[PDB]
Enzyme design. Structure first.
Site, mmCIF file in Angstrom:
data_model
loop_
_atom_site.group_PDB
_atom_site.id
_atom_site.type_symbol
_atom_site.label_atom_id
_atom_site.label_comp_id
_atom_site.label_asym_id
_atom_site.label_seq_id
_atom_site.Cartn_x
_atom_site.Cartn_y
_atom_site.Cartn_z
ATOM 1 N N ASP A 76 23.034 1.904 -6.674
ATOM 2 C CA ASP A 76 22.072 3.019 -6.780
ATOM 3 C C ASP A 76 21.341 3.086 -8.132
ATOM 4 O OD1 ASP A 76 24.173 3.989 -8.362
ATOM 5 O OD2 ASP A 76 24.096 6.014 -7.527
ATOM 6 N N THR B 37 0.794 -1.234 0.000
ATOM 7 C CA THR B 37 0.000 0.000 0.000
ATOM 8 C C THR B 37 0.827 1.285 0.000
ATOM 9 O OG1 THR B 37 -1.649 -1.220 1.298
ATOM 10 C CG2 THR B 37 -1.949 1.176 1.120
ATOM 11 N N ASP C 293 28.367 3.868 -12.507
ATOM 12 C CA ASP C 293 29.487 4.223 -11.626
ATOM 13 C C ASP C 293 30.483 5.129 -12.339
ATOM 14 O OD1 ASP C 293 28.511 2.707 -9.485
ATOM 15 O OD2 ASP C 293 29.995 1.116 -9.669
HETATM 16 O O1 LIG Z 1 -4.780 1.071 6.952
HETATM 17 C C1 LIG Z 1 -4.482 1.092 5.778
HETATM 18 C C2 LIG Z 1 -4.551 2.416 5.028
HETATM 19 C C3 LIG Z 1 -3.756 3.543 5.719
HETATM 20 N N1 LIG Z 1 -3.766 4.844 5.006
HETATM 21 C C4 LIG Z 1 -3.243 4.786 3.620
HETATM 22 C C5 LIG Z 1 -3.045 6.215 3.102
HETATM 23 N N2 LIG Z 1 -4.341 6.935 3.063
HETATM 24 C C6 LIG Z 1 -4.835 7.557 1.918
HETATM 25 O O2 LIG Z 1 -5.904 8.127 1.974
HETATM 26 O O3 LIG Z 1 -4.157 7.539 0.724
HETATM 27 C C7 LIG Z 1 -4.370 8.598 -0.209
HETATM 28 C C8 LIG Z 1 -3.354 8.676 -1.309
HETATM 29 C C9 LIG Z 1 -2.038 8.926 -0.947
HETATM 30 C C10 LIG Z 1 -1.050 9.013 -1.914
HETATM 31 CL CL1 LIG Z 1 0.571 9.314 -1.440
HETATM 32 C C11 LIG Z 1 -1.385 8.853 -3.255
HETATM 33 C C12 LIG Z 1 -2.707 8.604 -3.617
HETATM 34 CL CL2 LIG Z 1 -3.101 8.404 -5.274
HETATM 35 C C13 LIG Z 1 -3.698 8.518 -2.647
HETATM 36 C C14 LIG Z 1 -5.013 6.913 4.386
HETATM 37 C C15 LIG Z 1 -5.090 5.502 4.992
HETATM 38 C C16 LIG Z 1 -4.062 -0.155 5.080
HETATM 39 C C17 LIG Z 1 -4.448 -0.391 3.746
HETATM 40 C C18 LIG Z 1 -4.059 -1.551 3.084
HETATM 41 C C19 LIG Z 1 -3.284 -2.457 3.775
HETATM 42 N N3 LIG Z 1 -2.823 -3.682 3.336
HETATM 43 C C20 LIG Z 1 -2.078 -4.146 4.421
HETATM 44 O O4 LIG Z 1 -1.502 -5.212 4.423
HETATM 45 O O5 LIG Z 1 -2.140 -3.304 5.520
HETATM 46 C C21 LIG Z 1 -2.895 -2.261 5.072
HETATM 47 C C22 LIG Z 1 -3.275 -1.107 5.746
HETATM 48 C C1 LIG Z 2 15.220 8.011 -9.626
HETATM 49 O O1 LIG Z 2 15.125 9.415 -9.657
HETATM 50 C C2 LIG Z 2 15.587 10.077 -8.506
HETATM 51 C C3 LIG Z 2 15.274 11.559 -8.694
HETATM 52 O O2 LIG Z 2 15.820 12.035 -9.908
HETATM 53 C C4 LIG Z 2 17.078 9.821 -8.286
HETATM 54 O O3 LIG Z 2 17.382 10.157 -6.946
HETATM 55 C C5 LIG Z 2 18.258 11.295 -6.809
HETATM 56 O O4 LIG Z 2 19.595 10.960 -7.118
HETATM 57 C C6 LIG Z 2 20.551 12.010 -7.026
HETATM 58 C C7 LIG Z 2 21.941 11.398 -7.194
HETATM 59 O O5 LIG Z 2 22.135 10.357 -6.258
HETATM 60 C C8 LIG Z 2 20.481 12.816 -5.718
HETATM 61 O O6 LIG Z 2 21.155 14.043 -5.889
HETATM 62 C C9 LIG Z 2 19.040 13.094 -5.294
HETATM 63 O O7 LIG Z 2 19.003 13.637 -3.994
HETATM 64 C C10 LIG Z 2 18.229 11.798 -5.366
HETATM 65 N N1 LIG Z 2 16.886 11.861 -4.786
HETATM 66 C C11 LIG Z 2 15.959 12.791 -5.046
HETATM 67 C C12 LIG Z 2 14.656 12.625 -4.318
HETATM 68 O O8 LIG Z 2 16.100 13.741 -5.816
HETATM 69 C C13 LIG Z 2 17.438 8.352 -8.497
HETATM 70 O O9 LIG Z 2 18.830 8.256 -8.698
HETATM 71 C C14 LIG Z 2 16.717 7.737 -9.696
HETATM 72 N N2 LIG Z 2 16.982 6.310 -9.782
HETATM 73 C C15 LIG Z 2 17.251 5.684 -10.931
HETATM 74 C C16 LIG Z 2 17.505 4.209 -10.830
HETATM 75 O O10 LIG Z 2 17.304 6.241 -12.031
HETATM 76 CA CA LIG Z 3 26.247 3.209 -9.289
HETATM 77 ZN ZN LIG Z 4 -2.755 -1.327 -0.683
HETATM 78 ZN ZN LIG Z 5 -3.533 -4.944 1.790
#
Ligand SMILES: O=C(CCN1CCN(C(=O)OCc2cc(Cl)cc(Cl)c2)CC1)c1ccc2[nH]c(=O)oc2c1
Ligand SMILES: *[C@@H]1O[C@H](CO)[C@@H](O[C@@H]2O[C@H](CO)[C@@H](O)[C@H](O)[C@H]2NC(C)=O)[C@H](O)[C@H]1NC(C)=O
Ligand SMILES: [Ca+2]
Ligand SMILES: [Zn+2]
Ligand SMILES: [Zn+2]
Ligand SMILES: [Cl-]
EC number: 3.1.4.39
Length: 777
Positions: free
Chosen positions: A661, A157, A665
């Site tokens: 990563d 999730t 390299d």
């Molecule tokens: O208790 C939960 C859910 C906990 N939260 C998940 C995030 N959330 C939400 O509303 O997501 C909203 C949202 C956030 C993001 Cl970043 C992106 C999008 Cl497109 C939408 C609130 C509830 C759960 C669910 C499935 C599970 N399977 C399992 O094994 O344990 C579980 C626990």
């Molecule tokens: C996936 O993309 C992310 C974001 O471009 C890469 O993560 C970044 O990598 C560089 C170099 O290590 C760092 O300066 C950043 O801080 C990293 N994180 C973020 C959140 O920006 C990552 O390398 C990519 N992975 C692959 C496999 O391409």
């Molecule tokens: Ca590497």
């Molecule tokens: Zn889930």
């Molecule tokens: Zn689940």
């Protein structure tokens, strides 16, 4: 310390800090709501539907939703109000009509995006649940849809939801599982706990942050579980009825179903019909509610899921107490995946070599495989994070892993390649296409697409911007091909044979073999282009080996042996210097290391051309264990694929990823070399096998879309990953390659190369080709 009330503040968009108390959709999860939040903002009275008696209502504040004459003005009618009272039809009962432009009311400058996430919605529910899910079926059938969408590993999730929000892998954005342990923080992430609400766990830039930083109003996608689905939909419709300068552009709904039921009853249980009916009803409420506000031809709706659901029972459970002597002295993240950590106190005799050796190929039908995280397939992208434990057990589909010895009939978290873990995608609206099926894609690609729909410049992420342009009608991003930083040298014959004292001995094009233009090196280096009868190479003058070796093998190509007199043959290359060449003496002195060839000698055009295959500029360092895998691939499998696909073009080469990563390299990061030399040992070897999608046309005379399968083979001193490795190579080698199948895009990150630069195809189609994964499912 806080004070106040939520009168006229229920589900406010701006997150209000102290000294005022909160009234937003997450305030319950932080225990920060005002005293009267439940009474004012979570009313349930008289349900969520209008009846005939309710029509022409006098307003009652106690009601959950209204059926009064003034409900449409305030924007808080029940979703069926116009259907029951005013004689409109449900959205599901309307025949589909193409949305060429955003048919929006006054004030709406751009079409809003509504992301409708559904937890554990397996890919095959779309076809299997069709008749009980008519609303969803209208969105899928009349909008843009894929047969499935691939989640990220682990198929759980929190990693997938935050991957949908960020476009990043779990190793990058930080949420590597539903449970985690950070050794730096010395704290634990859990589903049950307050620790998950702290922002230190959550890396990257999620879509709602990307919006507000670029001036687009959004708000957080997370909902409190206590809020019922009808209140989530009504709130979303209420926000859509706000004034122009208060209204958000992006919206998020979340359904915990069908996941919750799926765990208890299994993915296709009889008790699973009602969950799917309720989810469709929730969608029908949204579309009836959008039609009511005249936004059903205005809004773009994305109907997506986080992962699938596999049949998993407590009978099918493997126990580490059967394998390990002291199973009580290790921590395990159990279930559909395994992560092993040592107990801290009074356990100095812990050893990860002993644990992996004790779990490697002990039962004949063993339903899990131990990996060091660096040796996990590169497609999973599950290594570069301190929260990911060194020891990882990859569990077979349908099975569980635990320490020592139902409540559940279903589960998820397996390999993201697996059919049962695949989830869904449906785009419906003006910016999406009409009645258009699209090929399946990875959920990491979605962040870019959502940014395009909102007119946002996306933060750096693991999508390939442009690869999903064929989904959209308009508002596409113009993908620019990356500029080549290092131009190639084209050396002529510059060296006599007697100049080479390499300790070697031996008794002694572009249109055919380089079909898609040369790969472009996108980092500062020095390399040579070497031409031959059967192959072309980009020979690295710093790493002393090819970065790529390109060759085409037609349908009717000859496979032949290496003769006895050319068994230990290594020829010097008269175009490249002694100082920039490998030497045989290093391989003689290195006991653990041997050599192999990128272009196979087995697939030479003639005995005369075969001597080009034994050039020192074609050889690469290989462990004898790996040399068995590589030689079988070259001898048997390349010809097999050429016969099946009407010829194939192969692009093989080394990969260096010692810090795991996923990126190429730099010279300083290479942690191993061939004994007493500057010849570096690759961590992996790749091959990109490209052919014509039209199987009637040969590979080297193809016009129309291309077909491709690739792999990133780990360069290992043993074959402990393959339990049948004691047997002949035809019983296990191809199975290994299938497990380590890869995208072309995966290889480009690891090599710093850019493929398919001279084709007759649009660049958007080539980016889609680069993101393809051949799954063998
Ligand atoms: O208790 C939960 C859910 C906990 N939260 C998940 C995030 N959330 C939400 O509303 O997501 C909203 C949202 C956030 C993001 Cl970043 C992106 C999008 Cl497109 C939408 C609130 C509830 C759960 C669910 C499935 C599970 N399977 C399992 O094994 O344990 C579980 C626990
Ligand atoms: C996936 O993309 C992310 C974001 O471009 C890469 O993560 C970044 O990598 C560089 C170099 O290590 C760092 O300066 C950043 O801080 C990293 N994180 C973020 C959140 O920006 C990552 O390398 C990519 N992975 C692959 C496999 O391409
Ligand atoms: Ca590497
Ligand atoms: Zn889930
Ligand atoms: Zn689940
Ligand atoms: Cl987990």
């Amino acid at each position: 310390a806080t004070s106040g009330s939520c009168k006229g503040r229920c589900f406010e968009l701006q997150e209000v800090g102290p000294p005022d108390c909160r009234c937003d959709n997450l305030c319950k999860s932080y225990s920060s709501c005002c005293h009267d939040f439940d009474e004012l903002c979570l009313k349930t009275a008289r349900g969520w539907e209008c009846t005939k008696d309710r029509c022409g209502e006098v307003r009652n504040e106690e009601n959950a939703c209204h059926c009064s004459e003034d409900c449409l003005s305030r924007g808080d009618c029940c979703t069926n109000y116009q259907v029951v009272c005013k004689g409109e039809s449900h959205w599901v009962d309307d025949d589909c009509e193409e949305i060429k432009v955003p048919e929006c009311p006054a004030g709406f400058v751009r079409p809003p995006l509504i992301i409708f996430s559904v937890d554990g919605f397996r890919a095959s529910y779309m076809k299997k649940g069709s008749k009980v899910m008519p609303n969803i079926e209208k969105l899928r059938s009349c909008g843009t849809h894929a047969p499935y969408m691939r989640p990220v590993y682990p198929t759980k999730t929190f990693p997938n939801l935050y991957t949908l929000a960020t476009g990043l892998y779990p190793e990058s954005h930080g949420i590597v599982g539903n449970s985690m342990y950070d050794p730096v923080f010395d704290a634990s992430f859990h589903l049950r706990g307050r620790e998950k609400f702290n922002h230190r766990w959550w890396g990257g830039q999620p879509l709602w942050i990307t919006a507000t930083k670029q001036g687009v109003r959004a708000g957080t996608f997370f909902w409190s579980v206590s809020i019922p689905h009808e209140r989530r939909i009504l709130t979303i419709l209420q926000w859509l009825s706000l004034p122009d300068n208060e209204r958000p552009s992006v919206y998020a709904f979340y359904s915990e179903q069908p996941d919750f039921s799926g765990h208890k009853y299994g993915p296709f249980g009889p008790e699973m019909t009602n969950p799917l009916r309720e989810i469709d009803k929730t969608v029908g409420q949204l579309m009836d509610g959008l039609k009511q506000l005249r936004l059903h031809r205005c809004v773009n709706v994305i109907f997506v899921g986080d992962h699938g659901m596999e049949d998993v029972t407590c009978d099918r459970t493997e126990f580490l107490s059967n394998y390990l002597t002291n199973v009580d002295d290790i921590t395990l993240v159990p279930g559909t995946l395994g992560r092993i950590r040592a107990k801290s106190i009074a356990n100095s005799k812990y050893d990860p070599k002993t644990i992996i050796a004790a779990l490697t190929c002990k039962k004949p039908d063993q339903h899990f495989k131990p990996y060091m995280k660096q040796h996990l397939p590169k497609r999973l992208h599950y290594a570069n994070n301190r929260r990911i434990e060194d020891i990882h057990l990859l569990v077979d589909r349908r099975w569980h892993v635990a320490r020592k010895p139902c409540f559940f009939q279903g589960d998820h978290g397996f390999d993201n390649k697996v059919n049962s873990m695949q989830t869904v995608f449906v785009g419906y609206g003006p910016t999406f296409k009409y009645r258009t099926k699209v090929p399946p894609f990875e959920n990491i690609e979605l962040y870019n697409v959502m940014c395009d729909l909102l007119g946002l410049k996306p933060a750096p992420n693991n999508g390939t911007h442009g690869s999903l342009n064929h989904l959209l009608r308009t508002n596409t991003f113009r993908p620019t091909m990356p500029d080549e930083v290092s131009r190639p040298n084209y050396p002529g014959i510059m060296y006599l044979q007697s100049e080479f004292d390499l300790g070697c001995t031996c008794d002694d094009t572009e249109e055919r073999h380089l079909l898609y233009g040369r790969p472009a090196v996108l980092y500062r280096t020095s390399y040579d282009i070497l031409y031959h009868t059967d192959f072309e190479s980009g020979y690295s003058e710093i790493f002393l080996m090819p970065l790529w070796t390109s060759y085409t093998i037609s349908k009717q190509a000859e496979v032949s042996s290496i003769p006895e007199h050319l068994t230990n043959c290594v020829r010097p290359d008269v175009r490249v210097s002694p100082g920039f060449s490998q030497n045989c003496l290093a391989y003689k002195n290195d006991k653990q290391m041997s050599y192999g060839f990128l272009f196979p000698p087995y697939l030479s055009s003639s005995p005369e051309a075969k001597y080009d295959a034994f050039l020192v500029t074609n050889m690469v360092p290989m462990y004898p264990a790996f040399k068995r895998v590589w030689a079988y691939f070259q001898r048997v499998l390349v010809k097999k694929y050429a016969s099946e696909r009407n010829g194939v073009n192969v692009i093989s080469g080394p990969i260096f990823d010692y810090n795991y990563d996923g990126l190429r390299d730099t010279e300083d990061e290479i942690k191993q070399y061939v004994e007493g030399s500057s010849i570096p040992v690759p961590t992996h070897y790749y091959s990109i096998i490209t052919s014509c999608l039209d199987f009637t046309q040969p590979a080297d005379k193809c016009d129309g879309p291309l077909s491709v399968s690739s792999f990133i083979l780990p360069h290992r001193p043993d074959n402990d990953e393959s339990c049948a490795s004691s047997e002949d190579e035809s019983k296990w080698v191809e199975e290994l390659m299938k497990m380590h199948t890869a995208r072309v895009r995966d290889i480009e990150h690891l090599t710093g190369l850019d493929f398919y630069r001279k084709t007759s195809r649009s660049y958007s189609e080539i980016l889609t080709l680069k993101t393809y994964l051949h799954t063998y499912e």
